[PDB]
Design a protein around this ligand. Structure first.
Ligand SMILES: CCCCCCCCCCCCCCCCCC(=O)OC[C@H](CO[C@@H]1O[C@H](CO[C@H]2O[C@H](CO)[C@H](O)[C@H](O)[C@H]2O)[C@H](O)[C@H](O)[C@H]1O)OC(=O)CCCCCCCCCCCCCCCCC
Ligand SMILES: CCCCCCCCCCCCCCCCCC(=O)OC[C@H](CO[C@@H]1O[C@H](CO[C@H]2O[C@H](CO)[C@H](O)[C@H](O)[C@H]2O)[C@H](O)[C@H](O)[C@H]1O)OC(=O)CCCCCCCCCCCCCCCCC
Ligand code: CLA
Ligand code: CLA
Ligand code: CLA
Ligand code: CLA
Ligand code: CLA
Ligand SMILES: CCCCCCCCCCCCCCCC(=O)OC[C@H](COP(=O)(O)OC[C@@H](O)CO)OC(=O)CCCCCCCCCCCCCCC
Ligand SMILES: CC1=C(/C=C/C(C)=C/C=C/C(C)=C/C=C/C=C(C)/C=C/C=C(C)/C=C/C2=C(C)CCCC2(C)C)C(C)(C)CCC1
Ligand SMILES: CC1=C(/C=C/C(C)=C/C=C/C(C)=C/C=C/C=C(C)/C=C/C=C(C)/C=C/C2=C(C)CCCC2(C)C)C(C)(C)CCC1
Ligand SMILES: CC1=C(/C=C/C(C)=C/C=C/C(C)=C/C=C/C=C(C)/C=C/C=C(C)/C=C/C2=C(C)CCCC2(C)C)C(C)(C)CCC1
Ligand code: OEX
Ligand SMILES: [Cl-]
Ligand SMILES: [Cl-]
Ligand SMILES: [Fe+2]
Lengths: 34, 137, 30, 334, 81, 451, 341
């Protein structure tokens, strides 16, 4: 079988985890009124 | 800073009475001003005549006085020159000439007060940008 | 001297175009 | 063979040093006329009233210019899009005053360059090649058409076309910014992405092939002698270059197909220049770039400036100063 | 060919989506709540729409000193009362 | 799966529509289905423009392109171009949209369920790209359909309500054309005019009589030409000149549509006759001439003698002379002195603008039309912000002339690239070296050296 | 074999993403410069340093978000988090512009690590380090523009701000104040970039249109094998084509691909030298012989004199808001304006 946690796994999640966090934050900004 | 009622307070007539607009009245006056006036009066100036602007200091010196809600509503019903000599309703949008200015047809008395309120509130917020032109962009 | 210098440098480039095209080293299928 | 056959055989002859062809029959006289006129005008042409306000602009070298400031001044603003040849003027002194040489140059030039493009297909057809080389040349040709013809058409005067000079070109760039905000147009951004990426990909492809040249020379002689003209064997190792560039990023962001790789070398810069030519062409009809002036507002109603409003301050500076004496009315509509 | 599991095997397997059916939406909610709660402002000092100027003020609170910069910003933020 | 993979067809998926070159049955389903998409958008966009339509606002302030195309044909408008009945706009949108399902049904059928090749089914509908006799017949049949459509426009102008004439006396109105221009010196006189300023080739047409009379000639020529190609085969000089293949024929139409694309772009940007300013807004030159007109009226009311006012450059601040002597407006608008509009001609005399008519014959309706067109100049941003590039956000307006000209120019350029692409390959495919150079029969290797 | 040679074996392992000794410096530095720009352009403002909104939180879009430079009062300070300005506070560190130096410095060490990565991988594979040498031109641009230019100026304030609309401001600033178009070093840089895009387009299109027929399909991309030993396109036919069309043509494959290396690298290097001169305000702003003539002759006019009037207009209109620390107050009567406009 293949390993689950690799250096490539770390490289992907260093970018993938914050990207969805930001997409959720930016999506909430679209409804902010003055 | 906020849009406080003391900012939304404008003179009602030339005798000292005032009226405090609501926040929805200002936003309604801003929408209708863009619907019927912003083509010539963007930012408080006048593209077809830069010699006359929408500054409150200019509306107070006109004859009759136009620096209040009553004077602005009367102007949108029977507009005149700066000295009030001629009636320019034939070449300026108004309810009297809504036949040739179709964007002035579906306006009501409540709408004119909102448009009159925005003209008197906006210079209190933008300062010299209202009626200043490209110099203050 | 300015106009003469510019035209002189420009004429040398046009003359260089002539020798680089018609008097190039012929490429040969070695 | 009669007269016409041997003449057609020589025109379409593949043994000529410089191939002529039928497209070259028009390209040769048109480009020679525009070239002879340009060199004479760049040196001895008198000042030209470009903006039609009786304010001539000196352009030639004999009238106080250098290589950086000299230019061939465009035609007058009073002429507009009117065809102004030599025989339409009462004298050459009038033809030279109103920008006559400019129309003669850009018309014979655009005609010759169009024939130059068709001439690229013609030689490829006689040699048995694929003919899409001229398609890549359509990108710089459409760019010349945009600043020389398409933009004057949309503005209604050839005086607004790009001048034929170094400092004149800079004037065309600044005025285009104030009147169209080209920097904020996504097509010029695509054009920058084409020329910035092209220079990147040109250095990238060149530094990888040279980094994998098979050893055929020594250290006391140039490595270029390791290749002989017309040899069958490839001069470098594409797998070794793929082995390096496949690890600088990751394996699959690297090309292993030389044909697909070189197709990418031709697609990216050409598609980028195609859009920036359409940018000048679409903005010729005043469909300008993004406008975000006074877009950010606080809770009260104050204007919260951004970098977009700062660009508007720079444009206003170019706006109120360009053609200082040619405007009598508050709005610059063309 | 380096030994890692191919990507097409992962994103098409069920177990990947059994895990990532909630991990992707939960992070989307986390970032959403980071702004809706107002924490995004207080962390980075970003001014609120009603915190750019004082009521009758029209001048930007620009920092004019290098070492006393932390003092002036707090002085500017205190005047919003 | 016939010719649906790269091995059996030779074309990758990004060139997968090229697997239809030798499949007449499936190819017919592609052109009938694409024709359904064209009528689908024509009907859906009209219903979208009608639901968003505000009658008291001008059409150019609402971003309409299809309703102005219908309003020009005299359906639903009254005097001055004012909308009086929005139901004809609804009918055109519904009927076009409803007809798209009929075209869509036959497109889907002929493309997956019908026969793959029409050579088996019928000798009348089956064709060969190298069949020079059959190709001209299909060209003649479609030429007759085009000639009929050109006469359908004439019938609308002469027998069914007429057209909207912006040059009609007393103001724009719907008018029936009774005397179309049959004189060939006037009709074919447009084709021989210069395309430069002051002439303008065919764009300078400024009356419906020259428009309707031209579509009579175009209709008769296509019918006579259609009957010609149906009964005839291409001559020898044409057989040795053109490449006879399916890809070559498409390359001819791409160069033809690209040429027509540039023509429509200049048509909508300069001509205000077949594109009335009441529906599409003032042209580029139109609004620029309106600013000089507006302030000429303003300063003259204040007592300024506009005929003697001298500008800073020495030229007239308000009026000057064209290079040929005609009295024209001053300023930067000297380039736009070729403009002709119904709201400006009353002030024009034998030598150009008449100063006596300027002092005493200016009407209030000419002043309102001058201020409206000035503030509606075809200038705007990509996010639809009206004004110059330095204008602040306030006005939501981009002229439909700018939307139509810029769009059909981008389409005209790419369709010229389609010509250079498909016509170059058609030459290489018919010659037999489009796939590369023969290693054992390289043509250049059999040629003498250049030097 | 000790711990050093054990760690060296693990760093140089053949995995999906190569690490290497350079990765100890490249990956963390490259990750912080990217994450620092993304975090700033989404949440961090520029209201106390420039008086501008520069994030998605305040209401900006992708074209107007930026990580603005520190205020002019900060000077050439490193603006460290633990430094005397921020005093260990992270929020105040963001309000003063500490992200800009956080991105510029960590990004500078990232470009050092990426070029070290090019050296290390090329040695393990067994190829020449020309891609690393060619990468010196991007490094030369970043060093001269983001570091050498502001350090010669008054502060970091006049350095490029990490934003789309902020870079466009940087272009128009160098036009009105430095006349950067007239400098001959930028001209050599323009010729290197446009000439590089020319070589890139003309080489790829020539190869694709001089291919040999190694397959029977219309899509000619499958007619190539990376292990093949024969050239895939006719160098001879391509040589004769461009000799008859253009006059001259390449005849050597190795010189051609080095020529593609020299043109874009030399262009950016020359433009970097000119920017270094701009750090000291050593501009190619004026021609003295032109000004002496125009000062004594009100009828002498060239495109050179017309562009300076645009530069004088650029400076007067944007300086009050672009340089708020100067506290410029320009009345309406001093602003240079043409007629009517
Ligand atoms: C086979 C082809 C062979 C070609 C061989 C060379 C032939 C010459 C080519 C012509 C090129 C056009 C030059 C003139 C351009 C121009 O002044 O064109 C504008 C004219 C319109 O003319 C204007 O027409 C106007 C007509 O309006 C008048 O009439 C109207 C009536 O309502 C209004 O009243 C209006 O106010 C009034 O002025 C006026 O006459 C103006 O003075 C006049 O300028 O358009 C036109 O004639 C029609 C449009 C011309 C095509 C536009 C050029 C497109 C070139 C695309 C090249 C792409 C290349 C890409 C390379 C890759
Ligand atoms: C090749 C590629 C290499 C790879 C890139 C690697 C990047 C690594 C990062 C490098 C870190 C460099 C930070 C330099 C900070 C700097 O300079 O910090 C600036 C300080 C100087 O500070 C400035 O000093 C000025 C001079 O002031 C003096 O003069 C004033 C006059 O009134 C007053 O009297 C004042 O009291 C007095 O101090 C003012 O004070 C400014 O406000 C203040 O910013 O220098 C100092 O720290 C030290 C200065 C001496 C060393 C300079 C070497 C480095 C700089 C090389 C570039 C020189 C460019 C010359 C212009 C071209
Ligand atoms: C204008 C758009 C258009 C049209 C009309 C066609 C038409 C066609 N394509 Mg092409 N194609 C297009 C665009 C288009 N293409 C584009 C943009 C690409 C690039 C991605 C391709 C790539 C491509 C490839 C690679 C191939 C085709 C092929 C084909 C043909 C057979 C398709 C088939 O068997 O699918 C079968 C598909 C199905 C049975 C799935 C259902 C499809 C139906 C039609 C959907 C209908 C939806 C609609 C709303 C229902 C309406 C109901 C009605 C009552 C109103 C057919 C003539 C093939 C070909 O040449 O055959 C020899 C082929 O191999 N196409
Ligand atoms: C002839 C084509 C044409 C023209 C001139 C217009 C013009 C207009 N439309 Mg319309 N539209 C069209 C086709 C067209 N449309 C089509 C095909 C559709 C179906 C999707 C629509 C659907 C549509 C809707 C739903 C609405 C409009 C609206 C509008 C108005 C505003 C447009 C706008 O803001 O653009 C914004 C500008 C852009 C989005 C930029 C697009 C740039 C394109 C994508 C570049 C493409 C390049 C090239 C073709 C791609 C190939 C490249 C390759 C060769 C390498 C304007 C009057 C609005 C309106 O006013 O309603 C009353 C509106 O609500 N349009
Ligand atoms: C480009 C148009 C076009 C062409 C060339 C064909 C050609 C063909 N189709 Mg197709 N078809 C089309 C459109 C087209 N069709 C459309 C739009 C539909 C949907 C309604 C169909 C539905 C359809 C079916 C269901 C079948 C065919 C079949 C056939 C074949 C025999 C047709 C026959 O015998 O008619 C002979 C002629 C007539 C029956 C008289 C028709 C008279 C018309 C309808 C009157 C109106 C004419 C007028 C010009 C219409 C103007 C339309 C407007 C848009 C301009 C032939 C290969 C058959 C086939 O392939 O069999 C295996 C078959 O079964 N077609
Ligand atoms: C849909 C349009 C169309 C198309 C594609 C064709 C296609 C064809 N026609 Mg036909 N034709 C048509 C409509 C069409 N026809 C109509 C409507 C008529 C009636 C007038 C004719 C009358 C006709 C005749 C009488 C003949 C053809 C012939 C031909 C064939 C050769 C054409 C050729 O070599 O042209 C090449 C064109 C030239 C060599 C002319 C030189 C170009 C001149 C100078 C035109 C100027 C171009 C200029 C740029 C345009 C500016 C505008 C203005 C100056 C005019 C070809 C199959 C011939 C044939 O063999 O058929 C049996 C033939 O003898 N056509
Ligand atoms: C490849 C790794 C790397 C590199 C080269 C840098 C480089 C840098 N970072 Mg960064 N950083 C990194 C990773 C890295 N970072 C990581 C992973 C994080 C997240 C945890 C950060 C978080 C971070 C922040 C938050 C900040 C920096 C800053 C800086 C800059 C100043 C660093 C400094 O002065 O350190 C000084 C310290 C050293 C150089 C260590 C020297 C160690 C030797 C062996 C001495 C040992 C002393 C001995 C043990 C005795 C101890 C002391 C004793 C007497 C009490 C510099 C450009 C600052 C900056 O750019 O401000 C604008 C800043 O504010 N970094
Ligand atoms: C990025 C631009 C891509 C341009 C494509 C141009 C190259 C295409 C030429 C054709 C070659 C053959 C076809 C290949 C095309 C190809 O095969 O694509 C698909 C590719 C291959 O994936 P696998 O091999 O896992 O796919 C399963 C296959 O084995 C089934 O055959 O997928 C990935 O590599 C996805 C990348 C995820 C990456 C996530 C991030 C990982 C961390 C990266 C951190 C890097 C930073 C480095 C520091 C500098
Ligand atoms: C082949 C093919 C293709 C194509 C396809 C197509 C192109 C198709 C078409 C289709 C079509 C094109 C269709 C259409 C349809 C339509 C319809 C179906 C309609 C309906 C309508 C209705 C139902 C309406 C209703 C109404 C009325 C009547 C009144 C008013 C209101 C309303 C609107 C409601 C593709 C690409 C996929 C690929 C593969 C193959
Ligand atoms: C409707 C109308 C009108 C009319 C119109 C007309 C009547 C038209 C016509 C049209 C026409 C009358 C057209 C024609 C065209 C032509 C063309 C466009 C041609 C082309 C050609 C070609 C393309 C050729 C080529 C070639 C060469 C040159 C050499 C050899 C080879 C070839 C053959 C390829 C008017 C304006 C009055 C008014 C409005 C409406
Ligand atoms: C600064 C700092 C730091 C760092 C942090 C980090 C590292 C962060 C990261 C972050 C991140 C890492 C984030 C991310 C984000 C991302 C995003 C937000 C993205 C988005 C995207 C999108 C939106 C897309 C779009 C598109 C395109 C581009 C193309 C086409 C298609 C589409 C449209 C889809 C620390 C703590 C160390 C320390 C302190 C300071
Ligand atoms: O000419 Mn050359 O640049 Ca086109 O805007 Mn108007 O006009 Mn003139 O001013 Mn701005
Ligand atoms: Cl200028
Ligand atoms: Cl003017
Ligand atoms: Fe290559």
């Amino acid at each position: 079988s293949y390993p689950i946690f690799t250096v490539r796994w770390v490289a992907v999640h260093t970018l993938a985890v914050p990207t969805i966090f930001f997409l959720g934050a930016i999506a909430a900004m679209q409804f902010i009124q003055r | 800073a906020e849009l406080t009622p003391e900012v939304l307070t404008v003179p009602l007539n030339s005798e000292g009475k005032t009226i405090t607009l609501t926040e929805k009245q200002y936003l309604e006056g801003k929408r209708l001003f863009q619907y019927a006036c912003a083509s010539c009066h963007v930012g408080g100036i006048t593209k077809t005549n830069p010699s006359l602007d929408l500054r409150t200091e200019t509306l107070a010196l006109a004859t009759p006085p136009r620096d209040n809600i009553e004077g602005l509503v009367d102007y949108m019903k029977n507009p005149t020159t700066y000295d009030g000599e001629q009636e320019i309703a034939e070449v300026h949008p108004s309810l009297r000439s809504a036949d040739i200015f179709p964007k002035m047809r579906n306006l009501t008395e409540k709408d004119l007060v909102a448009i009159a309120g925005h003209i008197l509130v906006e210079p209190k917020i933008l300062g010299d940008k209202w009626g200043g032109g490209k110099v203050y962009y | 001297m300015e106009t003469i210098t510019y035209v002189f440098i420009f004429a040398c480039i046009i003359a260089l175009f002539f020798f680089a095209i018609f008097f190039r080293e012929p490429p040969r299928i070695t | 063979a009669n007269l016409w056959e041997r003449f057609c055989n020589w025109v379409t002859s593949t043994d000529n040093r410089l191939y002529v062809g039928w497209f070259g029959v028009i390209m040769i006289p048109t480009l020679l006329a525009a070239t002879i006129c340009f060199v004479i005008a760049f040196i001895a042409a008198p000042p030209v009233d470009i903006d039609g306000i009786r304010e001539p602009v000196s352009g030639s070298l004999l009238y106080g210019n250098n290589i950086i400031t000299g230019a061939v001044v465009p035609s007058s603003n009073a002429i507009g899009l009117h065809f102004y040849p030599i025989w339409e003027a009462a004298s050459l002194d009038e033809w030279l005053y109103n920008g006559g040489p400019y129309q003669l140059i850009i018309f014979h030039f655009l005609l010759g360059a169009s024939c130059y493009m068709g001439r690229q297909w013609e030689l490829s057809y006689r040699l048995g090649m694929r003919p899409w080389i001229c398609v890549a040349y359509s990108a710089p040709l459409a760019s010349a058409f945009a600043v020389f013809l398409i933009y004057p058409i949309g503005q209604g005067s050839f005086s607004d076309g790009m001048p034929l000079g170094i400092s004149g070109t800079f004037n065309f760039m600044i005025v285009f910014q104030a009147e169209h905000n080209i920097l904020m147009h996504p097509f010029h951004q695509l054009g920058v992405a084409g020329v910035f990426g092209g220079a990147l990909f040109c250095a990238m492809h060149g530094s990888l092939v040279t980094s994998s040249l098979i050893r055929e020379t020594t250290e006391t002689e140039s490595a270029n002698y390791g290749y002989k003209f017309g040899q069958e064997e490839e001069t470098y190792n594409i797998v070794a270059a793929h082995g390096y560039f496949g690890r600088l990023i990751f394996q699959y962001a690297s090309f292993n197909n030389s044909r697909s790789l070189h197709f990418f070398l031709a697609a990216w810069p050409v598609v980028g220049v195609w859009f920036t030519a359409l940018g000048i062409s679409t903005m010729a009809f005043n469909l300008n770039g993004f406008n975000f002036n006074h877009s950010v507002i606080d809770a009260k109603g104050n204007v919260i400036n951004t970098w977009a409003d700062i660009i508007n301050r720079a444009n206003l500076g170019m706006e109120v100063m360009h053609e200082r004496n040619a405007h009598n009315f508050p709005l610059d509509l063309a | 060919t380096t030994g890692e599991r191919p990507f097409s095997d992962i994103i098409t397997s069920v177990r990947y989506w059994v895990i990532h059916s909630i991990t992707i939406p939960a992070l989307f909610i986390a970032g959403w709540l980071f702004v809706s709660t107002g924490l995004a402002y207080d962390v980075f000092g970003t001014p609120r729409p009603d915190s750019y100027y004082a009521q009758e003020q029209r001048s930007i609170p620009l920092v004019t000193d290098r070492f006393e910069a932390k003092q002036q910003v707090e002085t500017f933020l205190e005047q919003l009362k | 799966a016939t010719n649906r993979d790269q091995e059996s067809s030779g074309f990758a998926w990004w060139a997968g529509n090229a697997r239809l070159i030798n499949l007449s049955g499936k190819l017919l389903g592609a052109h009938v289905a694409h024709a359904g998409l064209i009528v689908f958008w024509a009907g859906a966009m009209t219903l979208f423009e009608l639901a968003h339509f505000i009658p008291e606002k001008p059409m150019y302030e609402q971003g309409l392109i299809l309703i102005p195309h219908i309003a020009t044909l005299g359906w639903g408008v009254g005097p001055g171009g004012e909308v009086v009945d929005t139901f004809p706009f609804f009918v055109v949108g519904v009927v076009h949209l409803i007809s798209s399902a009929v075209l869509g049904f036959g497109g889907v059928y002929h493309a997956i369920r019908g026969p793959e090749t029409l050579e088996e089914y019928s000798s009348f509908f089956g064709y060969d790209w190298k069949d020079k006799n059959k190709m001209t017949t299909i060209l003649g049949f479609h030429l007759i359909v085009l000639g009929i459509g050109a006469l359908l426009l004439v019938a609308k102008a002469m027998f069914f309500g007429g057209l909207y004439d912006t040059w009609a006396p007393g103001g724009g109105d719907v008018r029936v054309i009774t005397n179309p221009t049959l004189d060939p010196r006037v009709i074919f006189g447009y084709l021989l005019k210069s395309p430069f300023g002051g002439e303008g080739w065919i764009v300078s047409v400024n009356n419906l009589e020259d428009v309707v009379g031209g579509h009579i000639w175009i209709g008769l020529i296509c019918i006579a030409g259609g009957i010609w190609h149906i009964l005839t085969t291409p001559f020898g000089w044409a057989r040795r000149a053109f490449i006879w293949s399916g890809e070559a024929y498409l390359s001819y139409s791409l160069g033809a549509l690209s040429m027509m694309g540039f023509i429509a772009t200049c048509f909508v940007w300069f001509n205000n006759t077949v594109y009335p300013s009441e529906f599409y807004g003032p042209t580029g030159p139109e609004a620029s001439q309106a600013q000089a007109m507006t302030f000429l009226i303003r300063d003259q009311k204040l007592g300024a003698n506009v005929g003697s006012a001298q500008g800073p450059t020495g030229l007239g601040k308000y009026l000057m002379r064209s290079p040929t002597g005609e009295i024209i407006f001053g300023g930067e608008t000297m380039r736009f002195w070729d403009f002709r509009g119904p709201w400006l001609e009353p002030l024009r005399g034998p030598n150009g603008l008449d100063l006596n008519k300027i002092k005493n014959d200016i009407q209030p309706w000419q002043e309102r039309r001058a201020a409206e067109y000035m503030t509606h100049a075809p200038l705007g941003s990509l996010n639809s912000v009206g004004g110059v590039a330095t204008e602040i956000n306030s006005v939501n307006f981009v002229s439909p002339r700018s939307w139509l000209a810029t769009s059909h120019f981008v389409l005209a350029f790419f369709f010229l690239v389609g010509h250079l692409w498909h016509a170059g390959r058609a030459r290489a495919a018919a010659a037999g070296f489009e796939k590369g150079i023969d290693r054992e029969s390289e043509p250049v290797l059999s040629m003498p050296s250049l030097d | 074999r000790g711990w050093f040679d054990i760690l060296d074996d693990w760093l140089k392992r053949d995995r999906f993403v190569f690490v290497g000794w350079s990765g100890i410096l490249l990956f963390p530095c490259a990750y912080l410069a990217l994450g620092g720009w993304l975090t700033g352009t989404t949440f961090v403002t520029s209201w106390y340093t420039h008086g501008l909104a520069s994030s998605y939180l305040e209401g900006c879009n992708f074209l107007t978000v930026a990580v603005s430079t520190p205020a002019n009062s900060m000077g050439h300070s490193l603006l460290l988090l633990w430094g005397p300005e921020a005093q260990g506070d992270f929020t105040r560190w963001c309000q003063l512009g500490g992200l800009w130096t956080f991105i510029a410095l960590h990004g500078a060490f990232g470009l050092i690590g990426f070029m070290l990565r090019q050296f290390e991988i090329a040695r393990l594979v067994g190829v020449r380090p020309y891609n690393a040498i060619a990468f010196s031109a991007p490094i030369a641009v970043f060093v001269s523009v983001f570091l050498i230019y502001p350090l010669g100026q008054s502060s970091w304030f006049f350095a490029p701000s990490f934003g789309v609309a902020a870079i466009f401001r940087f272009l128009l600033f160098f036009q009105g104040f430095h006349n950067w178009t007239l400098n001959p070093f930028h001209m050599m840089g323009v010729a290197g970039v446009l000439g590089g895009a020319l070589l890139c387009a003309i080489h790829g299109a020539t190869v694709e249109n001089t291919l040999f027929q190694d397959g029977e399909g219309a899509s000619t991309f499958r007619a190539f094998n990376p292990t093949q030993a024969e050239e895939t396109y006719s160098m001879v036919t391509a040589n004769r084509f461009w000799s008859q069309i253009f006059g001259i043509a390449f005849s050597n494959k190795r010189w051609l691909h080095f020529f593609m290396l020299f043109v874009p690298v030399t262009g950016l290097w020359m433009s970097a030298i000119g920017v270094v001169g701009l750090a000291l305000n050593l501009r190619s702003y004026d021609f003295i012989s032109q000004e002496i003539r125009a000062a004594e002759d009100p009828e002498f006019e060239t495109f050179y004199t017309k562009n300076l009037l645009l530069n004088e207009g650029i400076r007067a209109w944007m300086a009050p808001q672009d340089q708020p620390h100067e506290n410029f107050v320009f009345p309406e009567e001093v602003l240079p304006r043409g007629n009517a406009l």
